[PDB]
DNA sequence: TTTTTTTTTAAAAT
DNA sequence: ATTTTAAAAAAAATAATTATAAATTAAAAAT
DNA sequence: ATTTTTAATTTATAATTATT
């Protein structure tokens, strides 16, 4: 699911694309972020003893708190986020949906088996795996992003595809998603492990497609044939193709049709009803939303209805949320630095690499 | 095999004392007409244009267009090994990991050679254009170094305004506004302590101060500095050496919201 | 499983351990020390040594011990009951009472938690050598940068190799084994705690011990007293504790620099508001100056 | 002011034990000190060991000689005044040390030995 | 409740109540050297004046049982020879240079307990060694001090006082200051002549 | 409204170099008869007196009795902007709590303005007694700062006394007890190295040392300083800066 | 009655400021020809001695011999009081537990009667041979100190080499390599610049940079320096003084297999 | 009804 | 000797709490 | 005026439970 080992492939054979930067190096920078898999991050991460963090109304107050404090963590450093929400899943995701429903079913059967067993850490693990995101998490966090004024988008097909759409038009600088296919979707600059904590102090891995297409020596279609050859969530993968031999195979034949024209069918068969062409068309051209159709503005977060909803419906502390929105407002007041690359073109220039 | 000699030795020591606190690694690009170094820092806040023309060299030579990716801090530390009057002589090679820096005595009682590793680099070459600037302010670099060095202690962001009478340096913070009105001194014809402003459009743009302490560290290169400002353009800080070449420093302005 | 030595004496250092097995009396074993008690403002401070033979390191890795930072107390108790049964898994701990660490770090010498931590570590590995446990590898995940720590431990102990790093509970088995032994030992010490002093309307259930816990904060604000502050169970040098001692309890300043810092004295408030103070030798002879005798004034 | 001393409070008082703090406190009056200070006395390797506000307190009883019996006194244009207790044993405490011969209170013990000598009446010749 | 005090007194205080119901009484009279109020205790059953000296030293306090007491105030109720307080009023009364009976010698309005100083037998026995008619003699009083200093030469020999300034011929400098806490500076400044 | 322009305000630069390490927040006594300063230090050991008469300025406007609450470390960092030969004007609003320093170039090449924020601090003035001091010593400031650094190198115990062979700045320490001996009266006609001593009573008392190093940060103010020693009083250290103003420092001694 | 008065103890205060970072505790000796030192450092790596001739002292009267147990940080803090022209004097008894120092004025105004305490230490004097050296190098000491400070920041090791044609200061750090030629400038005849290098056999040793940085701290008491080496002997850095004694600085060579 | 990363022991073929 | 499908599996934040530090921070101090 | 040579500052790791 996703792309298997693409970050492992860049770490192995093409390490010039990785820029291990710190979080403070984007002072005044506009970036699109996948929201729903961060909600998955805050449903598997914000768990106390296996019990999910809830209020007295019985609603999940975990992810609202977690990604509200994520917005505070980005904005207090000086980064304006852009959030996109995955809506309609694409029609090629049927096998991934079948595998997801199968692992849901065996995880819930394991949940009742461990509940009959009486253990507790297995209950913690299976409740970490089982809890999924419906529309309640999505529209509650959409109301939350309306409640601070940082803009939020509804992606028609894929969230990272909408990130690729708003970065190809230059509305944002990057896509900050730990799922790799937005590089294959067309987003130049990926940010990896941006959802790591402030106290974890993990540096942020940057992935530029300029260095990827330079060091791999490929165009967009050859790189996405490489990433389908490692394996996509929509289609299947060929049994018996690795990372490095697929890199050599794209460097040899440059297209999956010529690859299966010059492979061994007696040893390496394709799956039945193999649809790499329409998957290739979908990764080149997904159904995205227009970046120019929406205007970008990061308004002042209104406070009184924020604290009214957040303390009545969700029953939180007054001081923490009030200090958080005060930090958001004074960070918006004092993070007004402008970047120098906006007024120039870009061109690579190497040294005598010997 | 690139070999270069130069008469006034300490100009390289002063400019690499400037580059060391801002640029940690740089690519030394050899051209036909001189040495060029267009670098841009690790946080995308600055840009440095080192035009080191071949007219200022003693015996300049150029086989091909070399580009040495150089970690600049340790080699700046060993360029500091030369004295204030020591003659700087360069030697290089194409297929080599070492750059040779020859340091010799002015009375030639001592001739020394230093080498270092050149860890190879990849630099994004953001091409600077040529454009009209609304407020071209030629103004003393000792005075500019004074103003930025003591506006460091008042806050974080200076706002630079200008008019026909002079130029404004207004830095704010928790400790009030340090608004400095430098008078345009067109009455006196001094070479060093002269403030001349080209009057095209009165611009009001705001800048950084800690980063300005990282730029303004080389007032003994040129005693005067050309400040070129226009509307929402990057800054031009010109450190003109009269025959070595024109050194240019670039800062993006702070945006408003 | 021994705990009665904690019950009979919990003021100084107390030793709770397991006896040396037969195979660990001959084989050069491995060593592991980690932490529980450096965190909270309540409770004791527990460092533990686990010990196991060199071929059994893969068995200890297959015992599922290294994930011992995101656990629950009943699961901690049943895994503790799992590793206490086998003969090759033995634990030895020198628990440090809050009396001992508070009387350490509040003397004339401003003593340090990391300094007392390495002193307890050195005494622990010396007692582990003197018990007949032959070892060669020492794996401690202590707090701080570990290179000068390794140099100090190698200068103190040259015969046994000391290998210390940072965040080593997820990397070495015996480190996380000592961590979970110290954690279950701390929870055993605080969930079955008896005091030294006598009390009335007491509550043993106080909270988890850590200062941001609400039950611990409520107990910490309801058992505060003006004359003595707290019993022996509570640390007396921590910022929440020092905050509520300076708030609720009376002003107690000592003969050393206990937030007074007086050298030379004779402030000018007693030199200008008062015009002339009396220069009488109230200690007229040097006997009363050297022995602190002053004439009586009033009742 | 004239402060009469009651003579009935000298005989009926009860022996007890007293402890001396090596620092100062801001409170005078009632305090649960036998609840905490008395049961935490540990007979360690160097006498009596106890902790108060985290400071280690090493101390011992200082031998008050006979001919010197301690009295504990409560305050009360003529006036009365009235005691509550008598003793002979008091416990010096030093902060993580035994004060010993460097103590100003152990040196104050020999001043009634001086005051039995400086105030002896000289007989006639 | 209120402030609370600690004494250290001989057991001869206890057996001086079988005659008078309230025969002990805590009063304030003149300091023997400075000339101000100090806390004394007087008897007429056993009839000895007792001086109270406090241990007022910095940073000490008392754990009174089930109570507290700050200040470190240890009071030393010790017997005192009354002749210092006698000679203060005699050198006050010698200023007009006349004989004067004891009813109008010890007169002071700030310390109103001067009635107590006239009821002591052996007053003339003490006054013979330093001086009905009463006139102060300085030279006979400076004969009495060698019977007090050299007595404390032998007495502090038993007390084992380290009288050295590096903190017989050294006890004389040390007993110079011991009586100087109980006599004024006009009476002890000439004792350097009288130690020869 | 304030109009207080001085010809050379390097005197102001030197006094705020001499105050920014001893006192953090203090009070400037604003009056119509000059500029005064009166504030105890961080632990009530030293009081300040900069009795700066207003005759040195071009003009002097004082509309009402301003209770000035100023912190001196940050506004000393503000005053460090000015040059050694710079022209400095001080301006403050009549009803606002904001002080606006003006710096002006010698050859009129710039006009430099520092608006800076302030808050209303407490004002606690005290009176001054005057007595015929026991030992008044005229002795220059630079050698005084040198020997205070020298006795700071010794330890943390210094004793000051005078005698008929001269003053001694005797310092005791664990390194060893050392002496600094000067002449009673100097025959040198050069006034920057002349030491003379007025004596009424020789006496020895013990001082602190970090406060002495705080006192000797006024080294380039004046060439000579007159120090008057007396017992059971704070010291008087009269840094006389020509005729425009004088600086005084107080130090109550140690107890033995 | 041990005394030592000098008109100008500039050499004394310079070497006693310099040696404060070499030896923490260095016991002196009282000799007939002056003061003597023979002390090892805390890591037992570098050796130093002090020998001052008793000619130029004003009042140097020696009665007997006594090992002066001397703390060198006490010498640093007690000769830091000396100024540009403070006239030093030493004063001691036969068995004084302390040592008094007097610093009078040229105009007889100030007298600094300072006293230092003595600490008792075990005294050992290692046997040091005196012979003829393989290469004797005479060069300016200020130039030696600044180029030692130059090539010490380039790494951690130094290779010493000399010949009749020149003297090689080779040093190969982890950053790079740096080598210094010295030319024989005996045609130029100055006080320190008269470079005279006599040679017998070209020998090569390795030494330590950071301890040479400790050794170069006694520069401006003597503007000249003599260098002298042989095979597997300690290098003798000679800070000889033309009127007041000599300073010979020792360091054992490293081994490289 | 809507997200996938990370090693690793692992059997197994170029 | 390597290369690696595949099975499994771990598995994921975050402001608050504190002690303990670590390069940063003006500043003496000497060129 | 730089560049030391330090000390006394401001934010840094390693932990814990909860944060609800």
Numbering used by the authors:
A (entry chain D): 1 to 354
B (entry chain C), G (entry chain B): 1 to 257
C (entry chain H): 1 to 299
D (entry chain I): 12 to 87, 116 to 164
E (entry chain G): 12 to 142, 154 to 189, 205 to 233
F (entry chain A): 1 to 256
Task: Provide the publication's sentences verbatim.
Among them, PCNA (Proliferating Cell Nuclear Antigen) binds to the polymerases and acts as a sliding clamp to tether them on DNA, enhancing their processivity. Eukaryotic PCNA is a homotrimer, forming a ring encircling double-stranded DNA. One example of the PCNA-coordinated process is the lagging strand maturation, which involves at least four PCNA-interacting enzymes, Pol δ, RNaseH2 (Ribonuclease H2), FEN1 (Flap endonuclease 1), and LIG1 (DNA ligase 1). Two structurally resolved classes (PCNA-FEN1 and PCNA-FEN1-RNaseH2 complexes) have captured a series of 3D snapshots for the primer-removal steps of Okazaki fragment maturation.
The second one (6% particles) contains three subunits of RNaseH2, forming a stable PCNA-FEN1-RNaseH2 complex. After 3D classification, four structures of the PCNA-FEN1-RNaseH2 complex could be obtained at resolutions between 5 and 6 Å. The DNA in this ternary complex is generally similar to that of the PCNA-FEN1 complex, with a ~90° kink in the middle. The three subunits of RNaseH2 form an elongated shape, with the catalytic subunit RNaseH2A bound to the upstream dsDNA region. In contrast, in our endogenous PCNA-FEN1-RNaseH2 complex, the PCNA association is mediated by RNaseH2A, not RNase H2B. In the C-terminal region of RNaseH2A, a non-canonical PIP box (265-LRKITSYF-272) is identified, which locates to the conventional PIP box docking site of one PCNA monomer. Importantly, in all the ternary structures, the PIP box of RNaseH2 always associates with the same PCNA monomer relative to the one occupied by FEN1, further indicating that the spatial relationship of two factors is deterministic and not random. Similar to the PCNA-FEN1 complex, we found that the PCNA-FEN1-RNaseH2 complex also exists in multiple conformational states. The structure of FEN1 in state D is very similar to FEN1 in the PCNA-FEN1 complex, with both the 5′- and 3′-flaps stabilized.
